[PDB]
Structure 1
């Protein structure tokens, strides 16, 4: 469960350690994947030189950080490509577009059995509301598992937002660099426990597998991708969503796309609300405070209150004391 967040990382930077890592991963049924690369000075959308490939599987409580820079891609691909090509081992990404491009351009591999969970989350939004926006990991984690992505406030994350520096070319990598890189794959695997194999999720995993497969075909072409599959970087192709996920949903109460019945303001406003006692749920014509005759009492025979409320709550007419007005010693 949330034990995933406590998986230690392990730097894989030698051939011995690489072979040991591959052994573990090969028994996996799912492997979360992510890539850290040199930042680019330019305006190209392509990831820079691959530095780390991070992997976290359900086969071992450990995050492997493959130092692809030290190992070299040739060493790394020779041991990893069969596993990356194994469609019986699910590969979990969070937004796979540029990562898959880099795997294709820089490593010459194209993964199989890929499932993009950002695309999964948007698929759920599309089915329920006809929303095709991509959400960041921060938003999705907080929304699905109530956790705060605190790595977005870390020094590493700001160093890239500045963009002045490759960042990921330093060797040896500082501890908070590695811990930062481990968190991304930890979040991906943790997230898959909420989305994959959950009967309360309104989209079939296989359908999102088929939609993701379109993204991999579009982005793994051995060259940089000039034409993007989506109209803007932060959304998912609506025609693909329509083909693979189905017609987009909307509000069964008012009719509008963009929200569900449970979010509809028109439902919560048009609700019956009492002009006399303020309570929501009844009009004033049926209010018990305004018309106490609608309540005969179970234990005393007075109109206005049930059995669950036969106590005297209003203080004395005469002195304000803890009793009723008729029995005040000033009038009696």
Structure 2
């Protein structure tokens, strides 16, 4: 699965290349998606103009970078909409809210069969700790796969953070912009191997598909979305978490919300440590080394 991180990118910027990419993605079971958009100077909620859509599936070891700007939304949608609409093909996102709004407003398509892995992580946190906070991809990759995420080129990130120019409008795109764009979908598809079809994961994939579908419905309405689904940008609607995931959990050792027993201070600090030999698990009064007359 760390093979996914070495998938090279192909730029899909012609009608011919688009048919080929579409043919390959049609054979997939899961497709990780992302959007790179023109930076908004204003810094309002919606993504700016779609520049690239990035796709990486379990059907081929490759990241497609669809140059929507060059192809035009019209040509892109003609060939991609049935695949986007096909609920039998899982679309994997990391925070789908804005991406879905953009697909709806700018391309006229609503994706079906969507799974939001940022929402998946929060659902796990809800189930175990009563935490409805959203985590960045870095934190999630670390916590779930033990991977330190290789950041993208700092020029790209800096240009974007300044917010005074579009950034993603230049053509051709330099190589380091393309490599930046390909980053997220590889991480998304990698991450889905740890979350989907894994019995160590305490939430059902279908419950998260159902929570994801609330986000798709809220954000794919053909127009800019005014009222947000979540109380603040960095969390997940608690009422939706109760509905699709169930009641929030907490620490089985001390009863408090916010942590599990493996992270409980009181559980670790409460365990017997031998004052004589140092080993956790017995007291001194039961220590074979301190008292050999117990052998």
Q: Please report the TM-score for the alignment, with normalisation by the length of structure 1.
A: 0.86
Residue deviations 1:47-77, cap 9 Å, x none? 0111000001111111110000011101111
| CA radius of gyration, larger in | 1
Is the deviation greater in 269-278 or in 240-249?
269-278
Q: How many angstroms does 1:158 deviate by? A: 2.4
The Cα shift of 1:21 comes to 1.0
- Deviation string for 1:98-139 (max 9, x for gaps)? 000000111111100000011111111111111111111111
In the alignment, structure 2 segments of 5+ residues that lack a partner are none
1:228 partner SS: coil
Root mean square deviation, CA, Å: 1.3
4+ residue segments displaced more than 4 Å: none
Cα drift, residue 274 of structure 1: 3.0
Aligned residues of 2:56 and 2:64 also touching (Cα < 8 A): yes
Which residue is equivalent to 1:205? 205
Q: Distance in 2 between matches of 1:132 and 1:97?
A: 16
| Whole-angstrom CA distance in 2 between matches of 1:85 and 1:279 | 59
Q: Deviations over 1:23-60 (max 9, x none)?
A: 11111111100000011111311001110000011111
Relative to 1, partners in 2 of residues 1:90 and 1:33: Cα closer, same or farther, differing over 3 Å? Answer: same
Structure-2 separation of matches of 1:58 and 1:277 = 53
- Which of 181-190 and 145-154 deviates more? 145-154
Q: Secondary structure at the match of 1:28?
A: coil
Whether 2:219 is the aligned partner of 1:219: answer yes
- How high is the TM-score relative to the length of structure 2? 0.96
Q: Distance in 1 between matches of 2:43 and 2:56?
A: 31
Aligned length: 295
In the TM superposition, residue 151 of structure 1 has moved relative to its aligned partner by 2.1
Structure 1 CA distance, aligned partners of 2:269 and 2:47?
A: 48
Structure with more contact order per residue of length (Cα contacts < 8 Å, sep ≥ 6)? 2
Q: Following TM superposition, by how much is the alpha carbon of 1:152 offset from its aligned partner in structure 2, in angstroms?
A: 4.6
Give the match for residue 68 of structure 1: 68
Match of 1:15 in 2: 15
Residues 153 and 176, structure 2, Cα contact 8 Å, conserved in 1: no
Shift of the alpha carbon at 1:289? 4.2
Which structure 1 residue ranges, 5 or more long, are not aligned?
296-332
After superposition, the C-alpha distances for 1:227-259 in whole angstroms (9 at most, x for unaligned) are: 111111111111101100111111111101111
| Displacement after TM superposition at 1:194 (Å) | 0.9
Deviation at 1:199, TM superposition (A): 1.3
Within 2, Cα distance between the matches of 1:32 and 1:218?
21
Structure 1 distance, partners of 2:112, 2:280, is: 54
8 Å Cα contact 1:126/1:248 also seen in 2: yes
Report the equivalent of 2:294. 294
Matches within 5 A, 1:143-222: 143-152=143-152, 154-222=154-222
> What secondary structure sits across from 1:65 in the alignment?
strand
Pair 1:145–1:153, CA change in 2 (3 A): farther
CA distance in 1, matches of 2:98, 2:213: 14
Structure 1 residue 153: Cα displacement: 5.7
Q: CA deviation at 1:159?
A: 2.1
SS in 1 for 2:161: helix
The Cα of 1:3 is off from its aligned counterpart by 1.1
Deviation at 1:211, TM superposition (A): 0.3
Indicate conservation of the 8 Å contact 1:54/1:181, yes or no: yes
- Are the aligned partners of 1:151 and 1:157 in contact in 2 as well (CA < 8 Å)? no
Query: 1:150 is paired with a residue of what secondary structure?
Result: coil
